[PDB]
Amino acid sequence: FVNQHLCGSHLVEALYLVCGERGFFYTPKT
């Protein structure tokens, strides 16, 4: 695999990809 800049909707698309059924949180304020 690789390391890249993932921002905005692309970041959440990647989380969906990687987490799937486990679910995830997207918390940009931190």
**What secondary structure letter does DSSP report for 29?**
T
Query: Interface with other proteins includes 3 (CB under 8 A)?
Result: yes
Angle at 17 between CA 2 and CA 28, to 5 degrees: 85
* Contact pattern from residue 1 through residue 30 relative to its own copies, giving x for each residue in contact according to CB under 8 A and a dash for the rest: xxxxxx-xxx-xxxxxxxxxxxxxxxxxxx
Question: Does 13 sit near other proteins (CB under 8 A)?
Answer: no
- The one of other proteins, its own copies, none whose footprint includes residue 9, by CB under 5 to 8 A per kind, is its own copies
- In angstroms, rounded to a whole number, what is the distance separating the alpha carbons of residues 26 and 11? 9
Residues lying near its own copies in the complex (CB under 8 A) are found at 1-6, 8-10, 12-30
